[PDB]
């Protein structure tokens, strides 16, 4: 009847791990040498990439998995009331990274072209990103599992 | 007499894993720097590659292995009627990825040449893909095991 | 007196694995960026490489190891007459890959130079392959163990 | 009431490890070929990089994890008074690496541009670093866990 | 008094493994892109490298470790006179690879420069090899352990 | 009172391992393509690098760890007076590699610039090395642990 | 009253010469190395340039000046009825080159961009011409003087 | 008293010629390959150069010398009232080219940098012109002689 | 009635000169650096150009003008029967160069593409020539004047 | 006794002409493509060259020859008191260009290296000029003849 | 009867001039940048070109025309026996340059390929010359006129 | 008997002119882009070329022709004792340039290789000059005519 969510959290936990490590260092790994900017100006590349990518998706997520897994290893070793507390933390972190995500990345749709008007860059330049479609797809999966994990976590935290 | 399919599913499960990991990061790994486009136009490469490859085969498959393996880890931990349910999910996911596959990739035959008429690209350009033959071959194996796994799954789900 | 072949099959099984993984991703890994074609024509490289290498040796072999190892994991889990059946499959697969091998690759001697007259390629071009000698050597070892495994398998399948 | 800090130290220990290994060889790994200097002068690159990066962050930290983990493996095997000693060492090392860190790296804010006036380099050149923002972020996390680990360690060493 | 050689063989076995894997894919891994030939002639590189390196040292050795380790896994599983037989094979293989080694590689001293007069190569060209000194050093260690393993193996096979 | 050194040797043994593997293939791995020589002369690079680096630090050390770890696996399996013998070997090897180290590498301070007057190289050329500072630092740590391990080993070998 | 046209013909004759030789080998001289085509395909340049420029303006004109000046040197040396004949030829040649001009060059407005779909050229490529504006301007001057020379020539040939 | 201007016109006529031919094909001759634009975009060069240089100064001037010299060769051959007419034409042409000059070229001060936002050019690019100072100087001389020639021509045409 | 041909020969003589010198060093001058061959093979360019262009058109013609003008300067200075002799030579030379022309150059139509299978050139390569159309046009003019000069020369040599 | 200076002025006039035209377009002609600046920054070349060379020596001189030759063609045609006037102008122009010369060019010694800190140029860059010695030499000759021409002109203008 | 040779010498004198100046700076002018050597070795080009071309044909000839024309301007101005003297010099110079020619240039047939084994050049390299055929042709013409001029000069010097 | 030298001076005067202008701008014209230095160091080229070529031969000579021709135009216009004076100047200038020549250029033999150790240049570099042989040859001719002109000039100045 209740606490099926424990299962679903384990399922989605392992799921998220596998979604990352498989596509982890085989999608975004090449996202420094594949940022073709249409200029001879040295440095404009690194500037624009730092501009539109303060953090790469995979790092944010990996952190999110840690901060959301930390209450598990927290509640495991407590002694040799706390349940609901660790679970509430498990809500708010998740929600936080989702927020930060949408703020840094207007929506869940990578734009093929990105303009750029930083300093080394003389004027508005046109820099191209790698495989925006596919990254968008993986975003949709991980935000989806995020929303699920939230909703379950909220419901079973509402057990009264 | 029946439930030999449990064996065949384990066999083909491990099989599919081995078919991937062996040829996984040793076939498609070089499928970004081996997409020779016949133009000086910057960016046309990444655009055309994103066009004809929203997702690389191996990612789709890896997902398919997860969504089809999830009902196993689901049914394993249930308590400390559901059988047929997890099995039916195990059908529909498999079939789904096969459909998505054929839609994104007209048939199971990579074309050596691909034309391209996106934006950075001035007109219809001629971009060449890497090793289309061999990838086609591996597609045939994995779709084949897919069809098998379906057919078994349907039959033994038809046990009445 | 008999079924020493079980040992020899285990020995050669592990042997073949070790011959691969050692020289696996340390010989053929560089066999895309080391296919020097004497032309400016874009794409002629990928075309000619796909022409004379529909599959790289290591993939064929890896498959062969799987299809020949599958009857082992097959016979292991059967219940919780079949022996000779799994063994006969173990013959015919092995023989098949040897045939396919010799057909795709006229004999067991990589030619240093390969001509090529596909479409992007204007006329007969001269493309050079990497380390043909050494690959030939490893072919000789793996076909050799193949012939051995066949001969043993046939003899002990002839036990009557 | 007391020695909850043992937990928190294990938690943050494993935490720090995971923060590193995830972003370890996927952030700073490319920090040699992504140091774009605006000069033709050979060697000025390596000179300026050695100048402003005598050590890369990750090495310093990794050492810090070892010197701070060494008193654990020290106190574990002692026989087959020392507690407070190993703990005090565990304070002073941590504090030391924090100091060294702030000295080598004026504050916790990587500057996008760095000037350079070493020998091969004719005059003040303008060299650009990769992803200064993101590295700054990870610095903030690891110094943060550092300050926590200090404060706990000091308090529970003040148990009297 | 006798069969100390069993120890010494285990010691040197593990030794040889460690000498390889450490320097294995960190010395010879770059021995394709570091074969600087002083010509514009396409292909002359791959030709000359195949000429003076039919096999790279590490492959020969790895094989030698397998053929010399095979009699161990052979004698281990025999039943569920042979001792001296497996040991004699263990002699002759070792000696064989030492012979093949000295034949392919005149002595144990890599020459910095190598001339080359194959076909694509118009005339005698001057091709430079990478780090000949260091490879020579590792040759000396592995041939040394080889000679030791031989001598022990011969003596204790002479036990009468 | 005595044989605390057994602990300290285990501590520093594991320490040295961790100092290597962490910074092992993440510092010196790029020390072939980062040896910028100020000449068009082909080959002068490989010549000068072989000149001033007959061996890279990490190899020497790795060997030293093996030759110094070999008396441990030696004394472990002796039967199924020797103590002091294995320990004395454990002294002299350590001291040897320290000597060889200082001879090949005048002191423990990598020079940023290195001149070179070998054969392909027309005259005294100016070749630049990568990150000399940081490598110097790691040298200081490993020689330091070396001196410690010596001093302990000598003292407890002086137990009488 | 009449034969002012003799003057005007001398005036415009010398004029046309000066308009050419001044801008002759200082405008169109660089119209081979300034035909930037957006493709790597060898030869597509020369093909497209030959396509849209069977003849460069200046050659056509120079010929026109010769064929229109030939009746002058013709009528000069006749002996040591013909007047109207040489004059009529002087009309029809002029008119002819004007026609040929407008046919080869749709109007008197060089287009900045020119597409091209010849053979070496894979598909419709985008080739850019040099200084189309300025050449258009000089066309307007020379066609203008052409129309004048015609009109005068016709009128004074209509003297009856 | 009057018609000193005939002298001054001959003086300045020959002057202008000499100012051109000396600096003619030794200043602006290199003004196609010295228009460094900060972009990889093919064609943007020719576009921007055609934009800000519909005509190069020297052509405009050369024309002006012809149209202003034409009334001289006109008045010379008139027969074998007209004076003031040829002189008035000699005014209005001169004034015209001065006007056209100032319109095409905002003032007599070449700007070192010129932005550009034409079609091939993705956005506002920064293109650099060659030796803007020196060309400005020669403009000042030729406009100066122009103003003089005007003023004299007007005065002596005002002879009544 | 007769010897109008003297005029026509002077006319066409001066004509041919003017057709050359105008288009002389402004068409074929760039016919060495505009022979784009689709190969990296050094030297294949010069080989193929020497193959299909033993002589450039303009040289052949220039010679023809000299050998055909030599009988004029011959007959001019004879003293201080011969007429028909110098005229007959004037026929046969002209005819000769026309023959040689058609032999070296199959017809009067330059082919855009030329294949080439000389020695440095590995196989049949595809080399592109510059402006084949326009050169063909000038050939048609000069062969045309050649045929005229012949026909006149033959007729008036047939005066009897 | 007097007006030998007329001779000396003709002598030095023709002299100066010959000194220029010989070394004119054979020294400074290559002074745009031989201004090697040690930076990748586009445009910094043209900027720095315009900075330190507002005018090339030869232009200044050529002007000086014209303004100093203009009083000759002035005094020649005066009619069909003025002597001293044209001669005084002949002094002041000469002196003027000498002044302007020394101002633009600190002394008569071209510096091999020139630093530069204009806008595109990030900081003080090091740009190298071509053949500074030789240009200095020719400066010394032309300033020398200048001083002579002055001194004579002043003396014979002081005839009273 | 005699001294027709005066004519023939004038004819061939002017002839030789015209053969040169036409093909003079339009054949050998590009014979420095069209000497494609198949090596990366800097300098080997200039070395090999200096080796096989101590002097270019056209220089030798031009000298020969001067030394053979000098006795004409010699005999012209003698006063305001010598005839035969100037004529004999006119023989021996001509013959001399023919000898020097054949010595420097084995025969009158340029070889397409030339090997080269000078110092910078590591070993026998293969350098390709430009248009060897055509230069050979012009050699044949000029040596031919040389032999004629000799034979006439000898005969009419044999007038007795 | 005497003043044949007037002839010989005219002969050699015109000779020297022709030797220059023929080989003038067709030998040394390419002596800036053909100074191949074996270094990446920017600027070292221009430095070394300025070092070993403060002046190119042809300039020195051209000056020498002017200073030695100036006494001719001097003595021509003297009026509308001086003879020996102009002739003595004609000696000393000639001798001077010969001296300066031998000083700047150790002897009359251009060395193929030239070392260089100026400032930008890090150490002794190896720079290669173009066609040293041929330039040496022309030096021998012009110094030869120089010595002749001297000797004649001295003798006939010794007429008493």
UniProtKB/Swiss-Prot annotation, chains A, B, C, D, E, F, G, H, I, J, K, L:
Ranges in coiled-coil conformation: none
Entries under PROSITE patterns matching the protein: CONNEXINS_1 (PS00407), CONNEXINS_2 (PS00408)
Domain of life: Eukaryota
Effect on the protein of changing residue 70 to R: In DFNB1A; does not form gap junctions since the mutated protein is confined in the cytoplasm and not transported to the cell membrane; when the mutation is coexpressed with the wild-type protein ionic and biochemical coupling is normal consistent with the recessive nature of the mutation
One GO cellular component term noted in the UniProt record for this chain: plasma membrane
Keywords from the UniProt entry: Calcium, Cell junction, Cell membrane, Deafness, Disease variant, Disulfide bond, Ectodermal dysplasia, Gap junction, Hearing, Ichthyosis, Membrane, Metal-binding, Non-syndromic deafness, Palmoplantar keratoderma, Transmembrane, Transmembrane helix
Alphabetical GO biological process terms: cell-cell signaling; gap junction assembly; gap junction-mediated intercellular transport; sensory perception of sound; transmembrane transport
Extracellular side: 25-57, 104-136
Bilayer topology annotation: Multi-pass membrane protein
Annotated phenotype, changing residue 138 to L: In DFNB1A; uncertain significance
Residues that span the membrane, as ranges: 5-24, 58-78, 83-103, 137-157
Effect annotated for changing residue 30 to E: In DFNA3A; the mutant is targeted to the plasma membrane but fails to transfer ionic calcium or propidium iodide intercellularly suggesting disruption of both ionic and biochemical coupling; heterozygous gap junctions also show dysfunctional intercellular couplings and hemichannel opening confirming the dominant-negative nature of the mutation
Effect of residue 34 to N: In KIDAD and HID syndrome
Disulfide bonds: 37-127, 44-121, 48-116
Subcellular location: Cell membrane; Cell junction, Gap junction
Binding annotation for Ca(2+): 26, 29, 31
One of the record's GO molecular function terms: identical protein binding
Impact when changing residue 68 to M: In DFNB1A; the mutant disrupts cellular communication
Family (UniProt): Belongs to the connexin family. Beta-type (group I) subfamily.
PANTHER family in UniProt: CONNEXIN (PTHR11984), GAP JUNCTION BETA-2 PROTEIN (PTHR11984:SF46)
Function of the molecule: Structural component of gap junctions. Gap junctions are dodecameric channels that connect the cytoplasm of adjoining cells. They are formed by the docking of two hexameric hemichannels, one from each cell membrane. Small molecules and ions diffuse from one cell to a neighboring cell via the central pore.
Known partners and oligomeric status: A hemichannel or connexon is composed of a hexamer of connexins. A functional gap junction is formed by the apposition of two hemichannels. Interacts with CNST. Forms heteromeric channels with GJB4.
UniProt disease link: Deafness, autosomal recessive, 1A: A form of non-syndromic sensorineural hearing loss. Sensorineural deafness results from damage to the neural receptors of the inner ear, the nerve pathways to the brain, or the area of the brain that receives sound information. Deafness, autosomal dominant, 3A: A form of non-syndromic sensorineural hearing loss. Sensorineural deafness results from damage to the neural receptors of the inner ear, the nerve pathways to the brain, or the area of the brain that receives sound information.
Protein name: Gap junction beta-2 protein
Taxonomic source organism: Homo sapiens
Taxon lineage: Eukaryota, Metazoa, Chordata, Craniata, Vertebrata
Gene: GJB2
